[PDB]
């Protein structure tokens, strides 16, 4: 390798650049709180502000002048004995305390307090009661989370009567509980990832000094990523989510250790060939730095493709991951190269402690090259057979199962299910806004008509309205009923203050937040549409909000955005591979192999999670797993292809086989480390994060064991001359004469 260029500058400025990176670590970790704190205090919303459900609920609050935010929490009062007057006193005290704290509580629907709707709130057996509290801040935001914590503190402050307990649950409470669970599990997941990385590096390098230096590289790179993202989130530059924090920590550590393994393996291979420290470092840089730039570009762009989605979870997953991975890759390429440079001078720190294993990988490359068609067919079948999990794959949105059952929201749901149906604690708000006054006899006949119509919709269990204070009470209201003080209270609680909109509480029959709820939302909307049709009040709006409509918007956006982001990631990673290798065919092969490996990863992860774990796969697991797989598997294929291109000078088949012999151990070690670090999410209390990690780990195990090891070199050997189009590359070179004997 020629001693010049960026490698020379990093060589001479190794110590100053280590000092600069350390100073950056200190600055980013001394002026801004840690990633967990900023993620908790700068969490992104759950659903976009432009979503139909969010605008519907905001319109609910604006018209009814009760709240201004999309966040609801249920307060379940579960008692061993039937809820008597002492339970009513306790509930009234809770309501008064909540109204005394308007900073976090915007409105409280006193259904149980008013006798007219009291039986509506009580359970059928009369053991449990629930009250809705509309808090401040959109669901999932830091404001909503702190509102939920304030509500929980308020509930716990009031002395509950003996035999009666109160729990705070609901969607906003569920998001706050998922944040709490992630804060609980971040320490253990980081400790597990450290232990796994240390164990794998001890197994691979077998040198204490080498593993300590690599660990310093990885920890400082991860600190750089975490500090940069915390700085961005703290100054409100970018959104952030707890999903982003956990996934960023693990991807940062895993990719940093992969870059460390790449550089150390190349340096040790160069040393084992016979090159001295200077030449070995220069060769390692000139043969791996461009690979690491490409790997970082692929990961950053793949995550950035999520920034162009619609939901705020993927929006806050895109840019923060892109910036964090870019910081990780810059930290690797600069400070890891500098650390290798400085440690090369210091004795024999990075000198390999054992002969590198090439004979096995060289034999495997021979098997791949000589018979590329059978190997390629075998690996294609082995990677496509995973797609057998599609007829039966489920994408349950039920976030209750993905959180620990001891959390306040999960315990509240557990108390609810012991006396209520699963749906009655996740209701839906509907209304119609008349252009005229709604306090009229014919208007209430129309209201009763639409209530009956929405009740007759299949899958809807309970409907609550002015004419139906409970699940179920020729109809006619005489004018004298308008002056009834109880009826006036029911009016104020169900009608808009100006008497132009009437609210409806809708409770499903099955799970409201399962696909049945999504197919129920449109049915409710259309049914109300023809129920209001042919009426003097026709011409109103049908804003329907709640958890079911929210998940309907999220699921349609999830499907469309996952498809478009997968396509964008494919195109962008292909563009990056074409930029690096200057070979369109090689880039296409890398992308296709990663796609088929993704199919296998989907099959394996769906199998394990939905069939032996028993927990159905979460919806965002697919998107994050796809993005991370397109990043990392393509990165491994890029490293292999770059090594092949370097080795081509001796020939195509022999180039592939020499590249495999030289890089098989390095790539398999890196892939094992990354996959095991991702599977280290299996201990995360966020079962969705565990699903993401296990899916990515299994996918990358497939990538390194069979995809990178067999599929990519088999395609390369099968194609040959055309594998490097449009770069004019020959077949086996001109036959050299047989050398004179020595």
């Amino acid at each position: 390798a020629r001693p010049g260029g960026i490698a020379k500058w990093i060589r001479v400025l190794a110590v100053p650049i280590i000092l600069v990176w350390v100073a950056i670590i200190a600055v980013l970790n001394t002026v801004v709180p840690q990633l967990d704190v900023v993620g908790e205090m700068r969490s992104v919303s759950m659903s976009p502000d432009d979503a139909p459900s969010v605008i519907a609920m905001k319109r609910v609050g604006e018209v009814f002048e009760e709240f201004k935010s999309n966040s609801s929490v249920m307060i379940v009062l579960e008692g061993e004995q039937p809820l008597g007057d002492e339970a009513h006193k306790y509930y009234d005290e809770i309501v008064d305390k909540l109204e005394a704290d308007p900073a976090h509580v915007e409105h409280v629907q006193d259904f149980w307090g008013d006798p007219l709707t009291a039986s509506g709130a009580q359970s059928p057996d009369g053991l449990a009661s629930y009250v809705q509290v509309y808090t401040r801040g959109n669901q999932g935001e830091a404001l909503a989370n702190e509102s939920v914590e304030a509500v929980q503190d308020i509930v716990e402050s009031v002395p509950a009567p003996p035999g009666v307990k109160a729990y705070v649950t609901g969607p906003a409470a569920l998001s706050a509980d998922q944040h709490v669970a992630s804060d609980r599990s971040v320490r253990v997941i980081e400790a597990l990832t450290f232990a796994v990385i240390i164990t794998m590096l001890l197994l691979v390098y077998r040198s204490i000094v080498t593993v300590i230096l690599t660990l310093v590289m990885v920890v400082l790179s991860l600190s750089a990523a975490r500090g940069m993202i915390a700085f961005l989130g703290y100054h409100e530059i970018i959104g952030l989510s707890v999903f982003a924090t956990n996934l960023l920590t693990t991807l940062a550590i895993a990719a940093a250790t992969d870059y460390a393994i790449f550089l150390i393996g190349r340096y040790q291979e160069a040393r084992s060939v016979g090159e001295d420290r200077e030449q070995s470092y220069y060769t390692m840089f000139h043969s791996t730095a461009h690979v690491v730039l490409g790997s970082g570009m692929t990961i950053a762009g793949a995550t950035l493709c999520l920034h162009f989605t619609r939901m705020p979870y993927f929006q806050s997953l895109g840019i923060p991951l892109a910036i964090g991975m870019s910081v990780v890759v810059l930290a690797s390429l600069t400070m890891g190269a500098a650390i290798i440079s400085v440690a090369s001078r210091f004795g024999k720190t990075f000198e390999p402690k054992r002969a590198m294993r090439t004979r096995g990988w060289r034999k495997l490359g021979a098997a791949v090259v000589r018979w590329p068609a059978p190997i390629l067919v075998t690996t294609i079948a082995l990677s496509v057979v995973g797609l057998l999990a599609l007829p039966g794959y489920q994408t349950n949105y039920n976030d209750r199962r993905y959180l620990p059952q001891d959390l306040p929201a999960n315990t509240g749901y557990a108390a609810a299910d012991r006396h209520f149906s699963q749906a009655r604690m996740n209701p839906e708000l509907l209304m119609i806004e008349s252009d005229h006054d709604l306090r009229n006899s014919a208007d209430f006949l129309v209201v009763d008509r639409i209530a009956k119509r929405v009740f007759q919709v299949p899958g809807i269990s309970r409907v609550q309205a002015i004419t139906r204070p409970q699940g179920t009470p020729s109809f006619y209201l005489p004018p004298e009923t308008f002056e009834n003080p109880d009826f006036k209270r029911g009016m104020k609680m169900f009608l808009s203050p100006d008497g132009h909109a009437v609210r409806f509480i809708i409770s499903h029959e099955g799970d409201p937040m399962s696909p049945e709820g999504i197919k129920h939302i449109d049915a409710i909307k259309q049914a109300a549409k023809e129920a209001i049709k042919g009426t003097p009040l026709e011409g109103s709006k049908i804003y329907l909000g709640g958890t079911a409509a929210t998940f309907k918007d999220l699921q349609e956006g999830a499907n469309y955005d996952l498809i478009i982001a997968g396509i964008a990631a494919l195109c962008l990673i292909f563009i990056i591979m074409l930029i690096i290798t200057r070979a369109v065919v090689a880039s296409a092969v890398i992308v296709g192999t990663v796609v088929i490996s993704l199919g296998a990863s989907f099959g394996l992860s769906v199998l394990i999670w939905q069939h032996i774990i028993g927990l159905e796969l979460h919806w965002m697991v697919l998107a994050m797993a796809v993005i991370v797989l397109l990043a990392v598997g393509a990165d491994y294929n890029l490293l292999l292809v770059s090594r092949i291109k370097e080795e081509i000078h001796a020939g195509l088949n022999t180039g592939i086989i020499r590249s495999m012999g030289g890089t098989g151990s390095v790539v398999t070690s890196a892939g094992l480390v990354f996959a095991f670090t991702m599977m280290s999410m299996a201990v995360s209390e966020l079962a969705v994060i565990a699903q993401v990690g296990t899916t990515i780990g299994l996918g990358l195990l497939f990538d390194t064991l069979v995809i990178r090891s067999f599929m990519t070199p088999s395609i390369a050997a099968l194609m040959g001359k055309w594998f490097w189009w449009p770069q004019r590359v020959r077949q086996r070179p001109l036959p050299a004469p047989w050398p004179q004997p020595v």
């Binding site: 034999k363 086996r732 004997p741």
Partner: protein, 83 residues
């Protein structure tokens, strides 16, 4: 047509590139993996490397029948000198 010594030297150099067995060990009167310990898949490796960097074909059908380096060098001779 290349003679014995240069082809043996080329095979010895490719063994160096493969395993590292010293060149003077290879001799056209000795034997193969039952003597010098390079596996059948690593015969495939030897054959593909010698197809690439030396431009002489080796079929899998004839590979199994080669059990001395003398046998493979003889195959090289009667595959090269036939135009």
């Amino acid at each position: 047509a290349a003679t014995q010594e240069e082809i043996i030297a080329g095979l010895a150099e490719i063994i160096e590139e493969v395993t590292g067995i010293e060149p003077s060990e290879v001799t056209p009167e000795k034997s193969f993996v039952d003597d010098l310990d390079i596996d059948s898949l690593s015969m495939v490796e030897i054959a593909v490397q010698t197809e690439d960097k030396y431009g002489v074909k080796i079929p899998d059908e004839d590979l199994a029948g080669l059990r001395t380096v003398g046998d493979v060098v003889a195959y090289i001779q009667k595959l090269e000198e036939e135009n």
